[PDB]
Amino acid sequence: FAGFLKPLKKTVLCIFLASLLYTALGIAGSFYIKFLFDDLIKFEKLNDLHIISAGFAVIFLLQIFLNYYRSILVTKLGMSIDKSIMMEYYSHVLKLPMNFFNSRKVGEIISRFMDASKIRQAISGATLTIMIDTIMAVIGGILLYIQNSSLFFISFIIILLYGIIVTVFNKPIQNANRQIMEDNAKLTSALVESVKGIETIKSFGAEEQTEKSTRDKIETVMKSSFKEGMLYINLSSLTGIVAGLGGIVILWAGAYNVIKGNMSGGQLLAFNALLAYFLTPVKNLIDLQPLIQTAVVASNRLGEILELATEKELREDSDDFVISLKGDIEFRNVDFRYGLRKPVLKNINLTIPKGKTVAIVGESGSGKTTLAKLLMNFYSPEKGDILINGHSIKNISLELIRKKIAFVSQDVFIFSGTVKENLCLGNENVDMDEIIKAAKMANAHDFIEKLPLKYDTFLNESGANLSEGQKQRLAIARALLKKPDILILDQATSNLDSITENHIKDAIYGLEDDVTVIIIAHRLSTIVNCDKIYLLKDGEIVESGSHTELIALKGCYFKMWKQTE
Amino acid sequence: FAGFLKPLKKTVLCIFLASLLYTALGIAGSFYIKFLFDDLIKFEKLNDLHIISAGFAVIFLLQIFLNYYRSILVTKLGMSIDKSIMMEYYSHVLKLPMNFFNSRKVGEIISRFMDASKIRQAISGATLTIMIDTIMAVIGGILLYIQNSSLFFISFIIILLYGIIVTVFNKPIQNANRQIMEDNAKLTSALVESVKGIETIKSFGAEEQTEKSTRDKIETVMKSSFKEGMLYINLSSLTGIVAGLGGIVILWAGAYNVIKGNMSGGQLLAFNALLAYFLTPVKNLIDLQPLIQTAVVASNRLGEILELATEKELREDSDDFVISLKGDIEFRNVDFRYGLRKPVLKNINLTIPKGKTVAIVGESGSGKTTLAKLLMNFYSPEKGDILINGHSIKNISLELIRKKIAFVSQDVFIFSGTVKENLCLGNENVDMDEIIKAAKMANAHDFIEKLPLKYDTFLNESGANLSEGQKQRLAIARALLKKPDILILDQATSNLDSITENHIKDAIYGLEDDVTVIIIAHRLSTIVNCDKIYLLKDGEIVESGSHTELIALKGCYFKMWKQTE
Ligand SMILES: Nc1ncnc2c1ncn2[C@@H]1O[C@H](COP(=O)(O)OP(=O)(O)OP(O)(O)=S)[C@@H](O)[C@H]1O
Numbered sequence A, B: 001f002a003g004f005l006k007p008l009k010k011t012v013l014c015i016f017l018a019s020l021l022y023t024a025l026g027i028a029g030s031f032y033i034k035f036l037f038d039d040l041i042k043f044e045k046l047n048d049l050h051i052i053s054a055g056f057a058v059i060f061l062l063q064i065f066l067n068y069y070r071s072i073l074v075t076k077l078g079m080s081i082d083k084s085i086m087m088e089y090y091s092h093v094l095k096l097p098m099n100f101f102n103s104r105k106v107g108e109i110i111s112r113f114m115d116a117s118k119i120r121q122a123i124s125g126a127t128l129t130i131m132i133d134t135i136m137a138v139i140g141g142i143l144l145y146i147q148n149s150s151l152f153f154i155s156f157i158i159i160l161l162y163g164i165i166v167t168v169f170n171k172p173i174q175n176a177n178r179q180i181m182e183d184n185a186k187l188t189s190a191l192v193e194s195v196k197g198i199e200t201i202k203s204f205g206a207e208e209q210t211e212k213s214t215r216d217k218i219e220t221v222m223k224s225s226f227k228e229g230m231l232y233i234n235l236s237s238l239t240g241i242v243a244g245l246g247g248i249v250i251l252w253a254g255a256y257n258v259i260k261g262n263m264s265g266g267q268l269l270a271f272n273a274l275l276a277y278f279l280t281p282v283k284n285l286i287d288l289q290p291l292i293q294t295a296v297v298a299s300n301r302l303g304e305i306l307e308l309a310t311e312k313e314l315r316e317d318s319d320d321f322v323i324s325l326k327g328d329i330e331f332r333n334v335d336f337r338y339g340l341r342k343p344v345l346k347n348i349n350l351t352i353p354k355g356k357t358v359a360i361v362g363e364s365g366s367g368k369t370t371l372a373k374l375l376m377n378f379y380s381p382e383k384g385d386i387l388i389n390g391h392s393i394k395n396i397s398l399e400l401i402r403k404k405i406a407f408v409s410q411d412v413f414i415f416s417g418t419v420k421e422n423l424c425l426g427n428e429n430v431d432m433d434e435i436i437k438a439a440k441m442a443n444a445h446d447f448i449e450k451l452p453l454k455y456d457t458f459l460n461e462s463g464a465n466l467s468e469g470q471k472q473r474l475a476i477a478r479a480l481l482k483k484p485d486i487l488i489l490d491q492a493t494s495n496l497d498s499i500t501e502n503h504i505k506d507a508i509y510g511l512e513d514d515v516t517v518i519i520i521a522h523r524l525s526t527i528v529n530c531d532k533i534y535l536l537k538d539g540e541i542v543e544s545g546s547h548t549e550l551i552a553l554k555g556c557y558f559k560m561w562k563q564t565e
């Protein structure tokens, strides 16, 4: 932020100077009105009155144009800083590991986004008011000091009361602001989650469930909002009391100083205009009380960004100095728990050969996702390690692991946009020949040409038209187009059996076992065709081998095949 | 609003009267200050000065307490109305058909939510300032009219200029407001999409894609925001010109009327304070012009929410009062396309028997999910119809169809909450015996007891712990707990092969075919295990029968089995 401020120092200087001159001329002109009223009655001058009026009008106009240009500049700078900050936050939250994202929901990050944004705009208008109030405080302080000692005492009392009330209401406001932010976050989150699960609830029939949920959320949010609003109105009332009593005191002391022979009536009116130039600042503080809430929101945003900065330094934490392309993958004495108790791996030792197609068969929940996750460094391992290309996974570059290794998810995600792009996610500037070759190999090419707008059909949230089989085939197409050094596939064949049989035959033919292959499938029948197989049982690896040797082994796999196949 | 007025008329009257009287006393006390400075100081009466000052102070205090209580009440009412409206909108968008959900994305509804909310709060502060401005405008108008003709002319000119500028900037503001709303909505949508697909992006490696995307969205949003802000600053500058020139004119004409013998200096000051009691309205209007944008956004939001409430109960226009329990489901000459071209169903003739299990096997893209949607009345059929229990689906009650028919999805969704509740979605106040029996039958009961907090484990998204097999088993468990008159199951077994195999033996044994069964599975053998089978080929039904008869038929199904089995 400081660097950005430095790169806008000249604009800041222009704004500062313009503000100072504008405020000076403004006070001068209000005192021009004072002298106007004071001179015209004592000396009775019509022409001089007209001329003076014109002059003061001109002064006011110049002041107004200055405040105009200044406000424009400060607004531009403010909004620029806002955009920069928001983008930084979003980017830093994007580069975060799987654990931090899994620990929370979409609603959280989205709520934080919108809230922090609004807080930022509020911060830029607060910024404008801040510049004006600062300059007015300096100028007003000098002018008030010079103009009248007793009036300066009054102004000092007013400023003191204003400050005291403002701070004493400031401390309490931030907390309720945080609470309100939390409530709005929860409500928005429930809204998003309910929106996604629209099909589940519309089909199930439970509308009253989410209705009551949103009712409770809206109720609590309304309660907190009413509390904070009441506090704000209390603050406004107190500051209004200080200001008003300040005015009355100013009028009384003005009359007193007038009749005592200490000051003139024109000095009283001038005291009213310099009162405008001293009280302008405190009113700005009473308006600033709302900015404090935005500042609290900013504290929350910075706390979130501190959290976002966390899992950025862990991706780099293990450093790099390797330049490997594709290695043999072994798991050695692993013992990691993705939770407090009930470890996913109590002991897992596995081995997949370079240039060999491998299959891992286990039911859903056994340990199919964990292997791919551990290889991808999605979830770090607490105890024990793994070896890739004759090197630990910790030392390997995460970007190269990301690009060269492909993971086929059971739940494929497609971001809104053209199908060609959603298919070409990951690798940018990819030749159409490779994408068309992958599409042709994925056996989905027919379902790609069947689309209305060829390849550029709008695909938004599995909409408008989309097949699960075509989707998994598209995932496989992406994995193929990426030219993977390591290929991990879940039970994609299991998603849509018939077309998946053909497309799996085609993909198995295409693979040629030129690289390591992982299977997160439970379908034993589909995995037997593969070259080699590993077995995951009760969180522990049993025996590595082929279907024939494993079945002839007469162990647990043979028991599984006897029990199911 | 009318209903709120009826339920709060006395309070509203109290607030209005309090505002009028308070403002009156304010003007009176301001004229007390006028007479104070002009008469008491000039004629030199100290005691009267002190006493008068005290009195006017008291008047001001009473005014302040009145405005306080009024503002509190109006705030409460405002926020209540806000909550009501928001809840109504969300509820009406929840009860909407599948077509509206498919037509848009989460980002849309979420954006509308947040925007309409902020607009509502803005509407309550605009409401407070509006009440004060109205009452003060009436009193100030009368008093100004009586007090001085020329000053009234000045005030009239000021009000005229204010109104003209305000409207002429008002019309243009709403458009830019709509644009800003659209851009911000797009940004929020990109945010939500990025949030859901976090795993997809972490896996793919493409961070620069969403980074540049959100950068562009933020850029356009910043452009529109800066434009609207510039317009607002222009408005503020113009209104400021009107106000300032109004003041200068007031001072000059005041001096003129003073020296002419038409008015006193005290009459001039009183004219300035009653000017404050007329200008109270114009500052409020200047604040209302910025509020006007929020009001426009609220209007757009109301337009968006008004259109959505249509297709919730008007789609059937046939009434209900039907009491079927469980019927036979047949398809007759159906021809519906869920898109402009490429119809999903060109012709569909089918017949499903009461108390009989049916299985339909087809690849990804054939039309089984579309069929299930048609049975659920999720998507209505353009041409042709379907018959249930000797009655059209159009005439049947959608709620009874919702509760009595259960669909097990291939793509499982889990809403945030306790596992017991997520499992007991749909039917409220369900006995624990039925849920435990369904869990025991779903074979997931073991994986339910394996959980840390038994049944009350937190289930939010795919975190912290969740299995696909356990998920589909949970869907089946929910379907069982609902006590369905019609059971539609997708390839749930195909999601997670092994545990689904055991649980399929147990559940298929459990079903006992006491009701109609639909299959959206592609696994031909597992569906072959079922009682009767239907065939979907190229969007048209071929032949209904059993595996033996269909295979022996030597048609297309036999060709399919030759090609795959
Ligand atoms: N709402 C829709 N509007 C238009 N076309 C659709 C729509 N939903 C699906 N489709 C089309 O129908 C196909 C979707 O296949 P589905 O049968 O619905 O699902 P699926 O891939 O068969 O999943 P399973 O597990 O086999 S039931 C694609 O070819 C789409 O083009």
Ligand SMILES: Nc1ncnc2c1ncn2[C@@H]1O[C@H](COP(=O)(O)OP(=O)(O)OP(O)(O)=S)[C@@H](O)[C@H]1O
Binding pocket: A338, A339, A344, A362, A363, A364, A365, A366, A367, A368, A369, A370, A410, A490, A491, A520, A521, A522, B464, B465, B466, B467, B468, B469, B470, B495, B496
């Ligand atoms: N708290 C947790 N955090 C992260 N992962 C977890 C947690 N608890 C369980 N898991 C993992 O979640 C996975 C369950 O994935 P499943 O889908 O049920 O298995 P699967 O065989 O991969 O089925 P598919 O083909 O991937 S759909 C297991 O591999 C567990 O290790």
